[PDB]
Amino acid sequence: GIIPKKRQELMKWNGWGYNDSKFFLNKKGQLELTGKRYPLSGVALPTFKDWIQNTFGINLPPSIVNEDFLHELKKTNISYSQEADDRVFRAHGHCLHEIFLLREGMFERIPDIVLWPTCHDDVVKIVNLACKYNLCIIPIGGGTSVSYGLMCPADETRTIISLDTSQMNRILWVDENNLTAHVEAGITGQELERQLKESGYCTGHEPDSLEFSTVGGWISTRASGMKKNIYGNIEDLVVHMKVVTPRGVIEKSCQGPRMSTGPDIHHFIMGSEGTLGVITEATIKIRPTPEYQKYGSVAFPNFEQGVACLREIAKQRCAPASIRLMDNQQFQFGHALKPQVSSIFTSFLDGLKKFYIKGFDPNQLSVATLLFEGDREKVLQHEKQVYDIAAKFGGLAAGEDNGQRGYLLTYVIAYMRDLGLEYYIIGESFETSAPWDRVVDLCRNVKERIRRECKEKGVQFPPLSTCRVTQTYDAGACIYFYFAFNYRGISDPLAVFEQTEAAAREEILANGGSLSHHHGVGKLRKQWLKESISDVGFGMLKSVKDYVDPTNIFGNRNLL
Amino acid sequence: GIIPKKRQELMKWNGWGYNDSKFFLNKKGQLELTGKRYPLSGVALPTFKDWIQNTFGINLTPPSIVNEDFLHELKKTNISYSQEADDRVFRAHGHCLHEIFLLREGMFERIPDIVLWPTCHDDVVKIVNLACKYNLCIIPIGGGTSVSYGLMCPADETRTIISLDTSQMNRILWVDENNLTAHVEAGITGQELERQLKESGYCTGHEPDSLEFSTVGGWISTRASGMKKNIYGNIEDLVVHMKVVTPRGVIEKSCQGPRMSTGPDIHHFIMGSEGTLGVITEATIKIRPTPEYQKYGSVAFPNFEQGVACLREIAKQRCAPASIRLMDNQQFQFGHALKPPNQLSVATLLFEGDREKVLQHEKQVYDIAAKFGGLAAGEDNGQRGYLLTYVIAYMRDLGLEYYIIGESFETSAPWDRVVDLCRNVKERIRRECKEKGVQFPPLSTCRVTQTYDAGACIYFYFAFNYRGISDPLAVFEQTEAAAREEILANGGSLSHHHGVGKLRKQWLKESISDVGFGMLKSVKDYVDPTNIFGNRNLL
Ligand SMILES: Cc1cc2nc3c(=O)[nH]c(=O)nc-3n(C[C@H](O)[C@H](O)[C@H](O)COP(=O)(O)OP(=O)(O)OC[C@H]3O[C@@H](n4cnc5c(N)ncnc54)[C@H](O)[C@@H]3O)c2cc1C
Ligand SMILES: Cc1cc2nc3c(=O)[nH]c(=O)nc-3n(C[C@H](O)[C@H](O)[C@H](O)COP(=O)(O)OP(=O)(O)OC[C@H]3O[C@@H](n4cnc5c(N)ncnc54)[C@H](O)[C@@H]3O)c2cc1C
Ligand SMILES: C[C@@H](CC(=O)N[C@H](C)c1ccc2[nH]c(=O)[nH]c2c1)c1ccccc1F
Ligand SMILES: C[C@@H](CC(=O)N[C@H](C)c1ccc2[nH]c(=O)[nH]c2c1)c1ccccc1F
Secondary structure (H helix, E strand, O other), rough: OOOOHHHHHHHHOOOOOOOOOOOOEEOOOOEEEEOOOOOOOOOOOOHHHHHHHHHHHOOOOOOOOOOOOOOHHHHHOOOOOOOHHHHHHHHOOOOOHHHHHHHOOOOOOOOEEEEEEEOHHHHHHHHHHHHHHHHHEEEEEEOHHHHHHHOOOOOOOEEEEEOOOOOOOOOEEOHHHHHEEEEEOEHHHHHHHHHHHOOOOEOOOOOOOOOOOOOOHHHHHOOOOHHOOOOOOOOHEEEEEEEEEOOEEEEEEOOOOOOOOOOOOHHHHHHOOOOEEEEEEEEEOOOOOOOOOEEEEEEEHHHHHHHHHHHHHOOOOOOOOEEEEHHHHHHHHHHHOOOOOOOOOOOHHHHHHOOOOOOOOOOOOOOEEEEEEEOOOHHHHHHHHHHHHOOOOOEEEOHHHHHHHHEEEOHHHHHHHHHHHOOOOOEEEEEEEEEEEHHHHHHHHHHHHHHHHHHHHHOOOOEEEEEEEEEEEOEEEEEEEEEEEEEOOOHHHHHHHHHHHHHHHHHHOOOOOOOOOOOOOOOOOHHHHHHHHOHHHHHHHHHHHHHHOOOOOOOOOOOO | OOOOOHHHHHOOOOOOOOOOOEEEEEEOEEEEEOOOOOOOOOHHHHHOHHHHHHHHOOOOOOOOOOHHHHHHHHHOOOOEOOOHHHHHHHHOOOOHHHHHHHHHHOOOOOOEEEEEEOOOHHHHHHHHHHHHHHHHOOOOOOOOOOOOOOOOOOOOOOOOEEEEEEOOOOEEEEEEEOOEEEEEEEEEEEHHHHHHHOOOOOOOOOOOOOOOOEEEHHHHHOOOOOHHHHOOOOHHHHEEHHHHHHHOEEEEEOOOOOOOOOOOOOHHHHHOOOOOOOOEEEEEEEEEEOOOEEEEEEEEOOOOOHHHHHHHHHHHHOOHHHHHHEHHHHHHHHHHOOHHHHHOEEEEEEEEEEEHHHHHHHHHHHHHHOOOOOOOOOOOHHHHHHHHOOOHHHHHHHHHOOOOEEEEEEEEHHHHHHHHHHHHHHHHHHHHHHHHOOOOOOOEEEEEEEEEEEEEHHHHHHHHEEEOOHHHHHHHHHHHHHHHHHHHHOOOOOOOOOOOOOOOOOHHHHHOHHHHHHHHHHHHHHOOOOOOOOOOOOO
């Protein structure tokens, strides 16, 4: 559960996830995941190749560092490395461009040195040395950023420290009276839940990156998790934090559950994306481990009816732990991942239709997956409430097995990038939040802008462009898109990708969607920020950065 | 529901509330509230006199200095204004005890020079521009209900002070029934907002005790909390969007997405800013269908600790009703005295929602409560407790007629500090009063008004007969400061909801850290480099 210092021992140096986990063709020519890490690991996916084929049309730099600083660093006993593999591993997150530069290229700039502090006091020492020797610090936790938040600016001439938090990973206390846990910021989501569970508790904060993403990362990026309906997003979960900045340590003097003591400075730090200082410790709300979990799924005649149903569920404030509504292409894709071998003489579509002979169109139908957790009595009553609401919108119970499957798929989908890259398929997921009344139109127009933009950029085939609704709020929804294409005969595939991704974002903003729901701004969405938060708002951000970090030690250049 | 420009037409110039609403002795010698405005109005309270006697042992203007080029430009805007003394004085204070004395039997060091009534966002922009041009100071005012000296004009402010009154900027702009949000002007009062929305079948459910007069703008500025936050949220959960006029320009996000990751949330730079950065002119707030049904309740416990433990369990099972308040023995006796064993405690309950869910919920709560020795004590108690909510503020003016002074104060604290904090704060008030010559042991009582996952809001009342003290305000001021020191020393916060204003400024830096304080200052100096927004709250 602890990230080791030499990460490549465990994790892939050139893509997502663990070294022991990749898609390969088995001895029957069926896609399958190696290893035994996930419940889908070692399970043949006999229809998956076909769905890939049908969908995409393919056949299956020296360490520049001051010796005085070095010398002082040795006295601290803080572990460090100037090794290229350590530096490179920490020079990127998980944006598509980054993964290409790992594979077929090299980064313009990487950290000069990697430090592993093990506690708050180590971080204070490091920041003090950075003030003294004019060093730039870029913090890293899990390295899961999808916003270019870890990329080293190419023209940064100072020595860049990668301040790796992975060895600051302790739970410091569990306060069972107040249901809070105070933890060091480098603890990963899986390690955090694992240790709390041994005492009968959890946070319930479950981003899809939880295997590697950290408490400090979550706070920095305003992370959102699958079960936020019950447990809250990161801003609802964090009760307290400690932050080391060049100006000194930020920390409130008490742990009162709610205050009126001026503008909440916790929100000056949350979303700061490594531009102000290092979050070293935080107190986070915990809950007793749920007695009981129940999966579920519901089919709707179309997406629009599914959206209307999600809205009503939000309106009655009876959303389960997790509810996600997927469009018909994702419904199909999920169909394509089950274990029963088709006949080769019956098509994909004709195979689906006979299988679900619902009075529904199988090219229109959408599916919501559901997760309920809590006390078994409560969960079961609540499941019946949601299913009764769904019945009113044409909804039909589609079984716990799809829900259970959908929920497992989430930790596996990231492993599909690298598979795609082996076979000329590139893509990325992206997200927005939008008012309830813009959701349908926004999804339709964005998927369409992407088709028009690919066609016009010489993309041979119509791209995969697909969506689901992943979160519901009172005032709207999170919409999560996937965009993918075969880059067969494009001169500059990345450019085409990059430009199409920007055009989708322009379309999103024009349809009432936000700049980001959860991934953040990093360096990827900087150019829209000022418009999103207004000029004065941007200058307020700037004024906090100039005060706390006047010499721009925290020089990742995100946000501003 | 609109506050008139001449507030004294309807509201007491020297105290809380409406002119038609005061406690008096009726024709049977029983206390009673005059007028028809509350459900308790014109209802005799046979044993309230008796309770008071037992408890406290009693029986029963500077000129307006204004630049004429400024006034000349101001006339051209057609924005209504006044330099009249009664308008300026009315807006020179809130509802702290010391201010109510300077209002009654003295005079304020400093009052606004001129009162402006903008009716919209654009008016406000014009005003702020004129303040930049003529070097004027602006103190915003909504309901004037601050209990933190947040409206007090600094004595040495030599610039012309504008009281920028938001009461005529009070309209609902639109109600989006698809997204359940209402976009409103910031001067609307809570009662007028709920009244209008209720005609369309909606509510916000944000019900601070001051809702008759407090405004949307005020709530955002002070981080207000309401009685039913368990269902609807506090102000930070309710506000989806806002528009703010600062000297640097207008702050406003470009979209109404329900939740974002776009850097530090700048809504939180303005929420809690207490009039020091600019004017909140408009806000979008979440609404809900009006609940079908309300039910009251009450539970008796053998003592306060047991009640507290039960509240904690209720919070732990995340099954709090709309409101749950636990009062100590003294407040139980008080409440008993206001119908039409020395340690026994009582919780009042308010459930609201759909009838069948409410009844189900109510059973669940009584069940939990039985495990801490909790016994159902009737719906009528609960009802009465909640109907007293809006009349307690009228009791100050009663007490002042009979040499009784006091104030309420509040904190939030972790669950494991609540009982010790209550006991220690209450004893520190006794100790301090005796040492300063207060003849009779003060009233010193508490209740838990809100529960959260990580703790509770604790609400105190302190009051005494000041018979034979020579500086009774100084005794009060010092005792309240002492109580605050005791709260902080027992793990309580500087404020749960009242805010800091000028009253708690001295503790702020310690509460939020030096660098934290420095972050607030840097925002102020950016948005407002010449301190046009110069009430001097917080910093
Ligand atoms: C497969 C996959 C699934 C994902 N699922 C989700 C999801 O469900 N929800 C979601 O919100 N996000 C998701 N993400 C995005 C990402 O995991 C989150 O934004 C996460 O919060 C980053 O955490 P981390 O520890 O990896 O931070 P990193 O990626 O290490 O760094 C993030 C930013 O924070 C800074 N930083 C990191 N730690 C600290 C610290 N202690 N102090 C100060 N600054 C710091 C870095 O400098 C950088 O700017 C996903 C990403 C991937 C690749
Ligand atoms: C009897 C009584 C009961 C109360 N009950 C509660 C309660 O339950 N919960 C609670 O939280 N508080 C309560 N309070 C305190 C008070 O009502 C709240 O702080 C309320 O939010 C203040 O609103 P207001 O419009 O009265 O603002 P005012 O008191 O007019 O102003 C408060 C501060 O905000 C500034 N301001 C006002 N409007 C604006 C604007 N539009 N833009 C920028 N700044 C502005 C003022 O300069 C001042 O600094 C109570 C007060 C009293 C007297
Ligand atoms: C799954 C996706 C690639 C991708 O978007 N990966 C990133 C790292 C990712 C994967 C899952 C995420 N969940 C979330 O909230 N943010 C997420 C970001 C993909 C793979 C293969 C082909 C196309 C494609 F879009
Ligand atoms: C009721 C109280 C006076 C008082 O504190 N009134 C203020 C204005 C008040 C009244 C009600 C409040 N509710 C809340 O959250 N904060 C509140 C503040 C009182 C009256 C008479 C004698 C003593 C005394 F403490």
